[PDB]
Predict the structure of Epidermal growth factor receptor.
Amino acid sequence: GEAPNQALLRILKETEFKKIKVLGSGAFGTVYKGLWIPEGEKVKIPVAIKELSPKANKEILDEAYVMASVDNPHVCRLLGICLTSTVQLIMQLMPFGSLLDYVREHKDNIGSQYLLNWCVQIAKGMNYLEDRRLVHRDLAARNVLVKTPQHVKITDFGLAKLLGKVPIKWMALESILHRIYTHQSDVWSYGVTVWELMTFGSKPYDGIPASEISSILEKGERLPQPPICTIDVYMIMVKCWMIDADSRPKFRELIIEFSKMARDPQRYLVIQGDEEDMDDVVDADEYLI
Ligand SMILES: CCS(=O)(=O)n1cc2c3ccc(cc31)OCCCCCCOc1cc(ccc1N1CCOCC1)Nc1ncc(Cl)c-2n1
């Protein structure tokens, strides 16, 4: 029971945008890179169009509701939806793809400053979501997209729910065992995501069946310390992975700590060699109504 959600849901004409290329596909559906041109407004906006039964429409509209209810520089911006045969979701295009893929591809040219700034931005997005009493439930490096190497945004709100099949290796223990989800379980997943970033995109618990992850965590086992990580960063992750959810750090505290770290990045991360016509193109972050 909260304030009325006065967010605007925008309906976009299908004739207004052109699909350009396929970005990805799978059981969830397919996502296209494309361009959106509102009629007579003299702007072209690079967009991602998510697409794929009446059960699919229900969940896609739940995602549209969630994403239309949020507005943060570190959260995916939903431009609107196009009511075709299957409902399409129009989102801001993130040219550089997922943070996981970007990090795996560019690990040889990624420094401490970028990693700590990404941690700061992700924490800011999650803190904003907490302010909106929103629980993401699927936070991971694969669900963080790169608008620019200096700017990342949280996406994939398919599992997002209000405060009141799952990827086991990113979940808190209480979520694995009692299906309890809280902003602190999101903090656990944030720790796992930071681990993904610091190991340059390695698979957490590589080769371990998901069925024994619960026992592994119950025994006290945790993800190892990444080589580039000083005890400060790894301690932050371990705090995010504590059993008592109230003992885990809050997202605002993570913002503070990682900002402190980013002011002197080399003290906290040790990385070898650290030191056609688009005239009218407008990014969605600069197209407001
Ligand atoms: C994150 C789950 S998602 O369902 O919410 N989702 C959101 C997407 C998106 C794209 C493809 C996709 C799922 C997507 O298919 C399965 C995922 C496989 C590829 C992951 C990232 O791929 C890219 C994305 C984007 C640009 C390039 C890639 N890559 C680059 C090269 O390597 C292959 C493709 N720019 C984007 N901009 C807004 C949204 Cl909103 C999106 N992507």
